[PDB]
Structure formats: structure tokens, C-alpha cells
């Protein structure tokens, strides 16, 4: 289901076809369409990418990545920057708190994780713009 409470059609289709792998195995490739990325959006303008850093009331080490074998009580701020938001648990949406010293804040108060924009409070220069990537495996 979505954040608004409605269920995703390609997710249900994807997972049911994923359960249809019994009859035909190659049909399992439709699982990729059922993948829903979990993150937030701090993007204000299309060609302008700002940086929003919030803080959490829980331990960052507990939310860290379980690094496997090699085989050759509160965080000051979140690890999410340049908005590259990482994976986020829906239960961790209630424990986040916006910085009071933060320069840029949206017009709508952030409570639960979802899709929102960013509004400039100062409306001045130094928007802290970052460059773009180059040619490679992607476009």
C-alpha cells in the first residue's frame, strides 16, 4: 500500500505474478516493477538541488547497515544529505524531529514520511547548488 493508504496496482500485480513463478519461472522478472523505494524528498526546484539535514531521537548505530564478513544514545543529525536519502523504516517516521536552527523549511509541517517540496524562508543568495554527474553505466 501507499502512504495515503491506497494499494499499489503494479505492486499487487508484481507480487501475484511473483507467486505465479510456480507454473512459469521466467515470469518472476515482474517483481522489479513491484519495488517501492522508501525515502523522502527535499527538492524545491527542478534545476536546483538543496541540502536538508534533520536529526533523530534514536541511535544511528542501530539503524546502520549490518556489514557481513569480509572474506577476501542520540544522534546529532541524520546521515541523509544532498536532497541521497537511505532506507527508512515506516516506524522511524514518528521519531524524526526537524532542526530549529535549519535555514530552509517547508510551508507544511513534516510529520510522516511522504512527498513534499521545500520553501525558501530567507529568499536570498547562496542556495548551495551542486553539480551533475558524467557519462557512465547510466544515462
Amino acid at each position: 500500500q501507499s502512504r495515503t493508504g491506497h494499494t499499489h496496482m503494479p505492486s499487487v500485480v508484481g507480487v501475484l505474478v511473483f507467486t505465479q513463478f510456480w507454473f512459469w519461472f521466467p515470469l518472476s522478472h515482474f517483481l522489479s516493477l513491484a519495488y517501492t523505494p522508501t525515502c523522502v524528498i527535499g527538492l524545491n526546484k527542478d534545476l536546483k538541488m538543496p541540502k536538508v539535514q534533520y536529526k533523530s531521537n534514536c541511535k544511528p548505530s542501530t539503524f546502520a547497515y549490518p556489514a557481513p564478513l569480509e572474506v577476501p544514545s542520540i544522534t546529532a543529525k541524520a546521515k541523509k544529505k544532498e536532497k541521497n536519502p537511505a532506507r527508512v523504516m515506516p516506524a522511524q517516521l514518528k521519531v524524526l524531529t526537524m532542526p530549529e536552527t535549519c535555514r530552509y523549511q517547508p510551508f507544511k509541517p513534516l510529520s510522516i514520511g511522504g512527498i513534499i517540496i521545500l520553501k525558501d524562508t530567507s529568499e536570498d543568495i547562496e542556495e548551495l547548488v551542486e553539480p551533475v554527474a558524467a557519462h557512465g553505466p547510466k544515462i
Binding site: W22, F23, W24, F25
Partner: protein, 287 residues
């Protein structure tokens, strides 16, 4: 060098004909043929199945008469059976359902025409009447020994092909040998007809005949069975008199495998026949 997933379709026709062939499954070696039509590569259907006269030579490629074969096939062509032979079947009583040298040789000779060549071996002799389940056979190529053995998709049916779970013949003869899955097909006509025929087989002609018979036999036959039932029940009760002592002593664990309950319940089930046929007698008397 392409291989797909094949599944052999088996109807009630070939099944029953292989049951009659099971009655024909005497130790004397016998021959059989299977007919059908190929719609595509990965599916095979069999419809026309008959038997063959016995011989002293046994099963061999020389045993099959080509002119007689083509003759009977032509006689099937002039009739309403326009299907080409999809292979041949036989019986291997008592030495196992596997294939010998001569068998795999005449199989090699008979597979020269049809690439599929479905091989079916029925052996009702040591097969219990509890299950009629049979396993169809196939022939792997000798040039595939370099590459993988079976390049077949749909691996979900291998668990259904795991029915021959015997720990000897399977991985023992697994070298240069394998099998194929088996499924059936049924429509509404066969379903309704066979169900009605079987229900009628377990029923009477007018169905009111042998009912009232037992209804009036309740006062003669069943009574003695009820007396014997009371005898066995009392034979249980005499031990049931000894039971509360043990219940007053141990109560921990059960050293008696005898349930003493469900059997008496079944006795009550046999006792309910009188009650059920009472209303029957009421209906007979009334109108």
C-alpha cells in the same frame, strides 16, 4: 540443440486398456501400441490403445509384423480413428519395471521415426491395488553425456515425479536414463457419466429393492450382530471395571495402546442403522 518441457497426457481410455493389459500382464512377454495426434512439440496426447498377440520369442523388434501393423493402422484410417502411432508399451513382470538390452535396442529402433517415442511399462503383479499410479519412461541421447543431463524447465513437477521414491532403481539406474511427469484430463461428460454409473454400481436398479430387505432384516440378522456387539462391549467393560483402580494409582502416561473409545463409537454408528431405517419403514407403511 533445443529442449523444452514435455508432459504426457493420459486419458481413461489408455488407462483402462492398460488395466486389461494388466490382466494380460502374465509373465509371458507381451506387446502393445499407442496412438494419438501431435499438436506441437512440448505436448503429447494418446487416445487409441490396443493389445498384441503373444509369442514364444517374447518382446523383440522382429516380433512386430510390419505388414500386419500397417494393415491394422489402415483399418483404423478407414474408420473414425485418424491418429498416427505415438509409440509402444509393454509389461515387465517381476524382474522390475526397468528396461533390458533388447528392450532399449528395439526402443532405439522404434524411435528412429518419432523423436518422442513415449515408453510406458505397466506391472500390476507386485503393484498394490492401493495405487494404480504409473511412471512413463523416456530415452536420453548418448551425445548429451558431455553437457548437462536433463535441460528441462518447469522443475516444480519433479516433486510430482518423486513418486518413485525407491532408493535403489532410481539413482542406481539414473545413468543415461530418466523419466517424465504424468497428468490426466477429464471433461463434464466423462465426469457425469462415470460418476452416475459408479453411484448406480453402488446402488440398486429401482433403489427401493434391497433397502426394505435390510429394514426387515433388522429384526433377524442385525439383532444377532447387536448381541455379539454387546458381548464384545461387555468384554471391554470387564476391563473397564479394572480401569478406575489404575486411574486411582498412576494416571501418569498411557501404557495401553487400546483406545476403547472410537471402536465403541463405531458400534454406535452401526447401532444407528435401526434409527435411520425406522423412518424408512415409516415411509413404507404410510405411503
Amino acid at each position: 540443440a533445443v529442449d523444452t518441457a514435455e508432459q504426457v497426457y493420459i486419458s481413461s481410455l489408455a488407462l483402462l486398456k492398460m488395466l486389461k493389459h494388466g490382466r494380460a500382464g502374465v509373465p509371458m512377454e507381451v506387446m502393445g501400441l499407442m496412438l494419438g495426434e501431435f499438436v506441437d512439440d512440448y505436448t503429447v496426447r494418446v487416445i487409441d490403445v490396443f493389445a498384441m498377440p503373444q509369442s514364444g520369442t517374447g518382446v523383440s523388434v522382429e516380433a512386430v509384423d510390419p505388414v500386419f501393423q500397417a494393415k491394422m493402422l489402415d483399418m483404423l484410417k478407414q474408420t473414425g480413428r485418424p491418429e498416427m502411432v505415438v509409440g509402444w508399451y509393454h509389461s515387465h513382470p517381476g524382474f522390475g519395471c526397468w528396461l533390458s538390452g533388447v528392450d532399449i535396442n528395439t526402443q532405439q529402433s522404434f524411435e528412429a521415426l518419432s523423436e518422442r517415442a513415449v515408453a510406458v511399462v505397466v506391472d500390476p503383479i507386485q503393484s498394490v491395488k492401493g495405487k494404480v499410479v504409473i511412471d512413463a519412461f523416456r530415452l536420453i541421447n548418448a551425445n548429451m553425456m558431455v553437457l548437462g543431463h536433463e535441460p528441462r524447465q518447469t522443475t516444480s513437477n519433479l516433486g510430482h515425479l518423486n513418486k518413485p521414491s525407491i532408493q535403489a532403481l532410481i539413482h542406481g539406474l539414473n545413468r543415461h536414463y530418466y523419466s517424465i511427469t504424468i497428468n490426466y484430463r477429464k471433461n463434464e461428460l466423462e465426469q457425469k457419466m462415470l460418476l452416475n454409473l459408479h453411484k448406480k454400481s453402488w446402488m440398486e436398479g429401482l433403489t427401493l429393492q434391497d433397502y426394505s430387505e435390510h429394514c426387515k432384516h433388522n429384526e433377524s440378522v442385525v439383532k444377532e450382530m447387536l448381541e455379539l456387539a454387546k458381548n464384545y462391549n461387555k468384554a471391554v467393560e470387564e476391563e473397564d471395571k479394572m480401569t478406575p483402580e489404575q486411574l486411582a494409582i498412576k494416571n501418569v502416561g498411557k501404557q495401553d495402546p487400546k483406545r476403547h473409545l472410537e471402536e465403541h463409537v463405531d458400534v454406535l454408528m452401526t447401532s444407528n442403522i435401526v434409527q435411520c431405517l425406522a423412518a424408512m419403514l415409516d415411509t413404507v407403511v404410510f405411503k
